[PDB]
Design a protein around this ligand. Sequence first.
Ligand SMILES: Nc1ncnc2c1ncn2[C@@H]1O[C@H](COP(=O)(O)OP(=O)(O)O)[C@@H](O)[C@H]1O
Ligand SMILES: Nc1ncnc2c1ncn2[C@@H]1O[C@H](COP(=O)(O)OP(=O)(O)O)[C@@H](O)[C@H]1O
Lengths: 92, 153, 43, 49
Amino acid sequence: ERKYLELKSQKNLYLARLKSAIAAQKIEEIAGNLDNASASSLFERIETKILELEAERELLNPPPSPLDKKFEQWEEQQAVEATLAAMKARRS
Amino acid sequence: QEAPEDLLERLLGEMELELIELRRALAQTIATFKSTERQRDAQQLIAQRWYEKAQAALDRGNEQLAREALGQRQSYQSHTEALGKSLGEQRALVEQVRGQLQKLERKYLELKSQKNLYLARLKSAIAAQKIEEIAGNLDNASASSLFERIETK
Amino acid sequence: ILELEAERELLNPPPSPLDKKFEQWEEQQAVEATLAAMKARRS
Amino acid sequence: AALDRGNEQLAREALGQRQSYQSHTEALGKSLGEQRALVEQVRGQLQKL
Ligand SMILES: Nc1ncnc2c1ncn2[C@@H]1O[C@H](COP(=O)(O)OP(=O)(O)O)[C@@H](O)[C@H]1O
Ligand SMILES: Nc1ncnc2c1ncn2[C@@H]1O[C@H](COP(=O)(O)OP(=O)(O)O)[C@@H](O)[C@H]1O
């Protein structure tokens, strides 16, 4: 009788310790550590899936050249300079 | 396999259920520990009562009954020591289990604080990619863009 | 009963005894200051 | 008036008794300080609607 009571007084603690360890392990496989980049952590798999689509839609419709960006920026600067100069000069 | 985003939410819900299950199991563990502590206290109380009875029995001057009572209380003292030994380790173990649960809680909260941002970024990107296949570019003329197919038709 | 009493304690941690000591000392400081000034005001 | 007999024990008891009421008063004063600030914003929303 006493032996059985003693064993029943420990089954619960052992179950709790097993469950805590299982949950602790199951935490890792989702995120783990930020610097993993292991493609096993579910966040990196989402990140690669994002970048794949972002590049795939870029291939179909090419982005404008940096030369075009420089040209349009300079055109905007020339425009605003002309407006400000004539705008100061009109009230004068 | 399946799309990662749906299994992300499914796994997070399952993890929530497992966490509350762990909380309940730890509650039962601390309950049983308290019960064992109470039983140890009761046993030592009974041993003290037997010692007190022997104290009054010795007043007669017949030491034989005192010897009988003192030999009787030895088993109870041994049982009290046996339970005191086990408590000395169960108390040190439950604290570490509680610490593990406390850390897991914060980790889960942190992951749930980012699932939404990741889903929003995924939806924005897929919509941005889908915007193209209808029209794309005015000079695209790929016959895949739905406007050029209508124009040729 | 004990299971529920511990389970609701896990969800909302009780304060550490250090906080209890601190608040007890704060109460003692308050009562001593009040009684000292309270004696000294009529004097 | 309790300290008037010259025995400070009753004064100590009364001062220890009033501490709970002071704490409760402060607890309610903390909550009023935010409820008053929130009801005004709700009223403004209603007025604009
Ligand atoms: N301390 C650490 N810092 C950064 N990354 C780590 C660290 N420890 C492990 N990793 C990551 O773990 C990954 C290896 O896991 P992986 O090879 O994907 O698992 P499997 O072998 O099951 O495919 C590496 O990409 C590495 O970035
Ligand atoms: N910068 C651009 N200016 C004009 N048209 C472009 C540009 N980039 C891509 N295209 C268009 O993309 C089209 C090619 O797509 P297409 O070969 O029909 O797709 P798929 O390979 O799926 O059949 C070409 O007709 C071309 O006009």
